[PDB]
A and B are shown apart, each in its own frame.
Chain A
Amino acid sequence: SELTQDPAVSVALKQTVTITCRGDSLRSHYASWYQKKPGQAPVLLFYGKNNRPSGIPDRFSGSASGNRASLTITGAQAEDEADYYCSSRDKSGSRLSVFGGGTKLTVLSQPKAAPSVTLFPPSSEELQANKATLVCLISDFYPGAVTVAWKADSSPVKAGVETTTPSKQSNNKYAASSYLSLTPEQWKSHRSYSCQVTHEGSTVEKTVAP
């Protein structure tokens, strides 16, 4: 929090990427760096001026200048896709520690693929249960990042939207889902609703009508 990191970076398979952490406390303290994957504990990658723990591949290295500390991954492998966190003192001389906000590293390991999008209207069973949920299913895209926007008729819809972070499919492409929760009256009160999925600067849209 006194340590700032960019939320997301991409690197081509086998190439090199630098993740940066910035804070006033880095002017007098070194940072340590952690890798975090879902379902697994964080792992220490690098610490101090020039220390890489045993067991960590030598493609991970750390550097520091001024208010900045940097983790460089030379020759990124697919297994390096993960969140990376820096940690240091929250301020010079402090007894406390803090983590940066994390950087999600995407390792681009297969060609771009545009999302297929399916939009399900509320089922009659859900309507009878006095609820109305539209389900936007987003599948078969790479890399695994999308933005979802919803429209009621032609107006952007704000409240009632929940969207999952993209999850890997068995074909190694990604899927995501987005939900628009409405009351039956709200559902029946518009001519149409639209799910708009933007992926790498291109938008795919599907529309349903009650």
Chain B
Amino acid sequence: EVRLVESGGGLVKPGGSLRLSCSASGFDFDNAWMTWVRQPPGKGLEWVGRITGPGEGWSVDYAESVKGRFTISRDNTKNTLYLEMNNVRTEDTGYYFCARTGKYYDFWSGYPAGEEYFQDWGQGTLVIVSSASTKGPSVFPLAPTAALGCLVKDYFPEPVTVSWNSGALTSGVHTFPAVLQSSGLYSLSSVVTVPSSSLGTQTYICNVNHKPSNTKVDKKVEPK
């Protein structure tokens, strides 16, 4: 029925430009008010802007955080909403959502008091604003039931994938979310809890793949 699909996200440097698009189906797009909402990773939702329908003359309103840098447009023929992002900054990362916007008002309240609500949302497209260059991680052993692991350090951009023993070992494996360090580079760790009797006897290898750098590393994790 109602479908909203955002696209255009990706990597851009500070000062750069990028255009996001949201394709809509299953509703009257021509009369629909459409809103852009963003969520930086680990942070709250932020209203970016909204474009109205024909009754308000396709009027656009923007958050002060983006006014003068971001432009919202629509093509009713394509059922498409656009976000033109210019002079982007690091604070503009990351997930951008398109939402069909409803209007509510108490009819006979007698006090002018309208508000908007976001009834249908797309899944979002991720925008990373960063000056960092593509870089594969270094993989370091976290040597030791007992816990052992691999530290996947200083890579950009996300993601990295980590398996153990070529994917044959999954039970007891926990791969943590990445952290963004002050250097602009990500780091993560993957840990596995293993029988103590197996420490120097069974081999544990973490396999790290970083596609953006074509990095594939296999690190055997041995006791010290």
Contacts and interface: CB of A to CB of B under 8 A. Distances in A.
A170 to B, nearest CB: 7
Contacts of B112: 93
A47 B37 contact: no
Nearest to A163: B179
A81 to B, nearest CB: 17
A123 B44 contact: no
A70 interface: no
Interface string B45-76: 11100100000000001110000000000000
A85 B42 CA distance: 14
A40 B95 CA distance: 11
B171 A165 contact: no
A28 B35 contact: no
Nearest to B221: A123
Nearest to B62: A96
Contact of A28 (B113, B123, B179): B113
A123 B47 contact: no
B122 interface: yes
Interface in A148-167: 162-165, 167
Contact of B111 (A28, A30, A87, A167): A28
Contacts of A51: 104
Contact of B176 (A28, A34, A98, A167): A167
B151 A34 contact: no
Contacts, number: 136
A36 to B, nearest CB: 7
Main secondary structure of the interface of B (DSSP, over half): strand
Nearest to B122: A41
Contact of A32 (B50, B118, B149, B153): B118
Nearest to A41: B121
Contacts of A139: 147, 174, 191, 193
A102 B43 CA distance: 9
Contact of A44 (B117, B151, B176): B117
A142 to B, nearest CB: 15
A29 B113 contact: yes
A123 B142 contact: yes
Interface string B142-176: 11000101010100000000000000000100101
Given A101-B44, A177-B176, A179-B187, A30 B115 contact: yes
Given A34-B45, A42-B97, A162-B187, A125 B174 contact: no
B147 A137 contact: yes
Contacts of B119: 44, 53
A100 B44 CA distance: 8
A129 B174 contact: no
B217 to A, nearest CB: 12
Given A41-B97, A162-B181, A175-B176, A125 B45 contact: no
A33 to B, nearest CB: 9
The 8 closest A-B pairs by CB, nearest first: A32-B117, A41-B121, A47-B117, A162-B179, A48-B104, A102-B44, A99-B45, A120-B142
28 contacts: A28-B111, A30-B115, A32-B118, A41-B122, A42-B37, A42-B45, A42-B97, A43-B121, A44-B119, A49-B106, A53-B119, A83-B44, A87-B47, A87-B117, A95-B61, A96-B62, A99-B37, A120-B143, A120-B149, A133-B187, A135-B189, A137-B147, A137-B149, A139-B147, A164-B177, A165-B42, A175-B191, A176-B176
Given A87-B118, A99-B47, 19 more contacts: A28-B113, A29-B114, A29-B115, A32-B104, A36-B39, A40-B123, A41-B97, A44-B117, A53-B119, A99-B37, A100-B44, A120-B142, A120-B149, A125-B140, A137-B191, A167-B176, A175-B191, A177-B176, A179-B187
